[PDB]
Design a protein around this ligand. Structure first.
Ligand SMILES: [Cl-]
Ligand SMILES: [Cl-]
Lengths: 99, 5, 99
């Protein structure tokens, strides 16, 4: 699909058999999801934002379906305003910015 | 709002 | 141009005779520039994200050339770690997200 930016680019993602809304965010290196139960061990990771740095839990090899596109990668979980799909997963589903 | 490094 | 997201989507902007580097962020409602003096009156605003809120000065109808194309819009200036081109100006240049 081709997504315009008149409105926040919100998509439905399926994770753990659950549907969630997430923002496709080219300004995000990583994928950060709001607090949720994920499987396996997590490792510590610090990330910077507009407000400063926060600590998040890092999980590897999480399968996520973004608009029915399957992705498998690193997902970060911490206090985020909204679920954000960063360039790690965006490149996996073949997203590009065009103008 | 703005989005992470 | 079609930008891939293997790297940070950084482009050069020309703002008030200054050539700068900024992030094309589809996860930013608004353009936020690092601290600088822009002419015209301004209004204080608070913008949030990862790590919380920063106070910025909002300037209306500023002209920015993103990758050669001209765009007019609101421009916030504040203690931002990087210059960010948000949705407000991305739309102006015909930016889309495709996959
Ligand atoms: Cl990954
Ligand atoms: Cl605007």
């Amino acid at each position: 699909p081709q997504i315009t930016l008149w409105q926040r680019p919100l998509v439905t993602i399926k994770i753990g058999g659950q549907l969630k809304e997430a923002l496709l965010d080219t300004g995000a290196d990583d994928t950060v999801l709001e607090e949720m139960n994920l499987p396996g061990r997590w490792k510590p990771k610090m990330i910077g934002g507009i407000g400063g740095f926060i600590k998040v839990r890092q999980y590897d090899q999480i399968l996520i379906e973004i608009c029915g596109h399957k992705a498998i990668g690193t997902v970060l979980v911490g206090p985020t305003p909204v679920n954000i799909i960063g360039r790690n997963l965006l490149t996996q589903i073949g997203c590009t910015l065009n103008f | 709002v703005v989005x992470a490094x």
